[PDB]
Amino acid sequence: ECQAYFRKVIKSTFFQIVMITTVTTNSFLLVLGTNYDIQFEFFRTFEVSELFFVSVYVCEFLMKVYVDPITYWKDG
Amino acid sequence: INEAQTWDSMIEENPDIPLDDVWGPQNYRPCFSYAIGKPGDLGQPYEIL
Amino acid sequence: VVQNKISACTMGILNPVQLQKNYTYTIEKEAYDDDLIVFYEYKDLGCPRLVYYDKPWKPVVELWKNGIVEEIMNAEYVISEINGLVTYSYSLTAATANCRSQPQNWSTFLWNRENYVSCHEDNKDNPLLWPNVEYQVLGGQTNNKIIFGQRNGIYTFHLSVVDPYYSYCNLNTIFSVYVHGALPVTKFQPLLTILLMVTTTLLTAWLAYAIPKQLRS
Numbered sequence: 015e016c017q018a019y020f021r022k023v024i025k026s027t028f029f030q031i032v033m034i035t036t037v038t039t040n041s042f043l044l045v046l047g048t049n050y051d052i053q054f055e056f057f058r059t060f061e062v063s064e065l066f067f068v069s070v071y072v073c074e075f076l077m078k079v080y081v082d083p084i085t086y087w088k089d090g
Numbered sequence: 091i092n093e094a095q096t097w098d099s100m101i102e103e104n105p106d107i108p109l110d111d112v113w114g115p116q117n118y119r120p121c122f123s124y125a126i127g128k129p130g131d132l133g134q135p136y137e138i139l
Numbered sequence: 140v141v142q143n144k145i146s147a148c149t150m151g152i153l154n155p156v157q158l159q160k161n162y163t164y165t166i167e168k169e170a171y172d173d174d175l176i177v178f179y180e181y182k183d184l185g186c187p188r189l190v191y192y193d194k195p196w197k198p199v200v201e202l203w204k205n206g207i208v209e210e211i212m213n214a215e216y217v218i219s220e221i222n223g224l225v226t227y228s229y230s231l232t233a234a235t236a237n238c239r240s241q242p243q244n245w246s247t248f249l250w251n252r253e254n255y256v257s258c259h260e261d262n263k264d265n266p267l268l269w270p271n272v273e274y275q276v277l278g279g280q281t282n283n284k285i286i287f288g289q290r291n292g293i294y295t296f297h298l299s300v301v302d303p304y305y306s307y308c309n310l311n312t313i314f315s316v317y318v319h320g321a322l323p324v325t326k327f328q329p330l331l332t333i334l335l336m337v338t339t340t341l342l343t344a345w346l347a348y349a350i351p352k353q354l355r356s
């Protein structure tokens with residue numbers, strides 16, 4: 015009952031674009047991180063964003079293995 | 091090491107005096123001092139030859 | 140004179156012209172007594188040295204005689220901070236250093252080549268009990284190097300040769316070195332373990348509001 019809706023959340027197109035934008039913003043901030051000047055000004059931005067990104071990826075992993083105990087390891 | 095003297099700079103100091111008396115060994119200070127008068131913008135023709 | 144091969148000047152960091160017009164710097168209540176405001180002297184200290192925060196640091200010094208380079212001075216010496224900046228540390232400690240007695244420290248007293256006593260000298264009479272306190276002296280037979288923190292600012296340092304057997308002169312100098320590196324460390328109340336726990340709980344509430352969303356329809 016919850017599992018069905020939860021897989022329906024998995025397949026959410028909203029969720030697709032959420033993950034795509036999360037990863038793209040992470041890559042952009044990583045690129046801007048190779049300059050100490052911009053690493054200094056807006057450092058709090060970098061910190062909050064890094065913790066936000068790690069939270070998103072870990073929640074995705076945890077809930078996507080929640081929907082499925084064993085077959086999760088099938089996918090490469 | 092610092093802003094070396096030039097005709098324009100000296101003329102600014104004592105304009106109405108004619109050019110013959112403007113520059114003299116009495117008022118000549120070298121740039122080499124590094125502790126002399128100043129550190130003006132670098133890159134400019136050098137007139138002392 | 141301390142070597143200054145790549146001075147913060149002439150790089151894309153500091154500009155000697157702005158340094159001349161009363162360049163000034165501040166302290167964020169972290170050095171000693173508070174909000175210290177110090178205006179740099181370019182006539183004496185010249186263009187500072189630059190040191191990336193990170194890599195233990197130990198300065199290079201040339202002894203000059205008769206107005207020419209005599210040699211690289213390899214004798215022991217100590218080094219101190221003028222303003223009272225305290226965000227620096229020493230690589231070696233008393234236990235690991237080759238000391239057979241309690242070494243002296245800037246805390247007890249100014250320093251000089253006269254009052255210095257060698258820690259390598261075997262003396263047990265007074266130092267019966269001695270902890271692994273920091274080791275201050277640089278050079279000589281000790282491989283100590285200096286470790287800076289996160290201040291990212293100019294440090295004005297007073298170097299004094301300490302080995303009395305080197306020379307009768309009290310050789311000493313003053314110089315300025317600019318550290319570049321450390322960034323704001325305000326992890327503060329928020330911590331990483333406390334942060335995935337905080338965020339994922341805010342993400343189960345999305346599912347906790349998702350269950351009624353699914354069951355009410």
Ligand SMILES: *[C@@H]1O[C@H](CO)[C@@H](O[C@@H]2O[C@H](CO)[C@@H](O[C@@H]3O[C@H](CO)[C@@H](O)[C@H](O)[C@@H]3O)[C@H](O)[C@H]2NC(C)=O)[C@H](O)[C@H]1NC(C)=O
Nearest residue numbers: 233241242243244245246247268269270271272273274275
């Ligand atoms: C410089 O050296 C002096 C000692 O000549 C240091 O003060 C002394 O430090 C020792 C070792 O800490 C103290 O002995 C004991 O230390 C333990 C450390 O946990 C402490 O719990 C004991 O109560 C006891 O203090 C000794 O008492 C102390 N003596 C004095 C007069 O301070 C000093 O800290 C060193 N400073 C630096 C910057 O190296």
Ligand SMILES: *[C@@H]1O[C@H](CO)[C@@H](O)[C@H](O)[C@H]1NC(C)=O
Nearest residue numbers: 159160161162163178179180
């Ligand atoms: C700069 O320092 C000089 C000291 O010779 C002082 O006379 C002058 O008022 C100072 N100016 C500023 C802006 O700090």
